[PDB]
Design a protein around this ligand. Structure first.
Ligand code: HEM
Ligand SMILES: CC(C)=CCC[C@@H](C)[C@H]1CC[C@@]2(C)C3=C(CC[C@]12C)[C@@]1(C)CC[C@H](O)C(C)(C)[C@@H]1CC3
Length: 443
């Protein structure tokens, strides 16, 4: 039929990659503003269709895996996780790799996690000093590594996390580059450093495994399970695969969540009217319950909603992609096989027909309004359809647990001008800007 509007101005051989890569959010916003719900642009030779608003986002999330696939779209992750891991695997092996974390997400170990997160938060706070100034993002990133390593991989893997590990995960994270969606292997300094980080991490996990074999005393874990893990065909998981799934599991638990946990604290200090309501329902469950339980955090609607609104305005994953395997239509336009197709939470969340006065921070979420369930394909920080986030329960839990432990025994103040705090829209995993300072004081 008719086909999508293609954006002009594409440089020769590079398409819009230069414009896109400077500020991906800004590019995608401008593309929707110009051409509406379905708009094509080029990343080098790759023809990309931005799908925005409810109807087009529905087509994206609801498409069968035989028409829209994640695999070719996410080659970027192959040099990070390793060959044959998640998206670089056959489906049957991918599903089995995802199924080996699912046990850590069940009701039973979740009662366990509340005490581990508090332990970890207090562990970093003991070394503090009564009043001072910290970088909120630098801390939150470090904290979510300990928090997610301990909870989902166990105390055994958490005991070895060091500075080498800290740098290794920053080098791995820096592998996520606008150019890397198209050409994930290039003779670049950012790529060599990610490759070196992975090789090094695989050497340290292999050594930790050699040791656990000699001791042979250590057992009872999710990491131990991986070490002993085989596929349903009885193939043994290698050190390479195990390393890949430890990386994937910290990307999931830590890299998604560092920014959005910083933002919750920033956004409450910016709007002290919501700080007072959140700090009320925290102290309220500090009073009624003893310490922070799991059911206590499940019944915290004020905080649940500030996180929900933080995710509408600061969705960390701003570009979800599929390769188009079979021609399909949206709003009566033929998106041809071989093209790629994109969802943009950052931009769909800012559509005024879906979120009246989009740029206003208003946590009217669990209220009669219900702007998030109004269209499961509107609000989409966690995606939608078959390949929706399968870890949202733990994600929301982890940041709740962290913030209402921080705000229960520290007073916070923005060390700079409240408007100074912005998102670095130069990254694909969007977090607050580079230097992000804050001040504290015990209660
Ligand atoms: C606020 C933090 C988080 C955000 C914003 C987030 C966002 C997302 C999004 C947008 C996707 C879909 C990507 C796509 O459609 O291609 C996704 C998938 C996924 N997320 Fe998360 N996530 C978060 C935290 C977590 C955590 C903590 C875990 C695990 C503990 C996790 C596990 C997963 C998994 C396994 C998938 C793949 C789903 C599948 O293909 O079956 N996420 N996440
Ligand atoms: C322990 C295991 C096997 C868990 C599986 C975790 C993965 C499915 C998650 C971890 C990080 C994750 C959320 C991510 C993404 C998808 C799902 C991932 C890979 C993607 C690739 C979505 C598209 C984004 O543009 C971007 C490239 C930033 C992210 C990176 C992190």
């Amino acid at each position: 039929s008719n086909t999508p509007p293609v954006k002009p101005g594409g440089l020769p051989l590079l398409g819009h990659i230069l414009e896109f890569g400077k500020n991906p959010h800004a590019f995608l916003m401008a593309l929707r503003h110009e051409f509406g719900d379905v708009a094509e642009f080029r990343m080098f030779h790759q023809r990309m269709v931005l799908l925005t608003g409810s109807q087009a986002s529905e087509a994206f999330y609801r498409a069968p895996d035989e028409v829209l696939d994640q695999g070719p779209a996410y080659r970027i992750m192959t040099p990070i996780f390793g060959r044959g891991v998640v998206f670089d695997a056959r489906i049957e092996r991918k599903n089995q790799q995802l199924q080996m974390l699912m046990p850590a997400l069940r009701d039973k170990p979740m009662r366990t996690y509340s005490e581990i997160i508090v332990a970890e938060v207090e562990a970093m706070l003991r070394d503090w000093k009564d009043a001072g100034t910290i970088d909120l993002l630098e801390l939150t990133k470090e904290l979510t590594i300990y928090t997610s390593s301990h909870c989902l991989l166990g105390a055994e893997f958490r005991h070895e996390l060091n500075t080498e590990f800290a740098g290794i995960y920053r080098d791995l994270e820096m592998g996520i580059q606008p150019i890397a969606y198209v050409f994930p292997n290039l003779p670049l300094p950012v790529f060599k450093r990610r490759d070196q980080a992975r090789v090094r991490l695989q050497e340290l996990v292999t050594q930790i495994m050699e040791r656990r074999a000699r001791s042979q005393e250590r057992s009872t874990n999710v990491f131990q399970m991986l070490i002993d893990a085989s596929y349903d065909d009885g193939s043994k998981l290698t050190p390479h695969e195990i390393t890949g799934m430890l990386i994937a599991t910290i990307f999931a638990g830590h890299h998604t969540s560092s920014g959005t946990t910083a933002w919750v604290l920033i956004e409450l200090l910016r709007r002290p009217e919501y700080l007072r309501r959140v700090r009320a329902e925290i102290d309220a469950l500090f009073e009624t319950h003893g310490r922070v339980t799991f059911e206590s955090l499940r019944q915290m609607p004020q905080l649940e909603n500030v996180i929900k609104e933080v995710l509408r305005l600061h969705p960390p994953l701003i570009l979800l992609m599929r390769k188009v395997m079979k021609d399909f239509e949206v709003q009566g336009m033929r998106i041809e096989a071989g093209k790629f197709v994109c969802a943009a939470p950052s931009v769909t969340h800012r559509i005024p027909e879906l979120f009246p006065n989009p740029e206003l921070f208003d946590p009217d979420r669990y209220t009669p309004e219900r702007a998030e369930d109004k269209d499961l394909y509107g609000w989409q920080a966690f995606g939608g359809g078959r390949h929706k986030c399968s870890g949202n329960a733990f994600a929301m839990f982890q940041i709740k647990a962290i913030v209402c432990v921080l705000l229960r025994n520290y007073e916070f103040e923005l060390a700079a001008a409240p408007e100074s705090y912005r998102d670095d829209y130069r990254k694909m995993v969007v977090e607050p800007a580079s230097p992000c300072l804050i001040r504290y004081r015990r209660r």
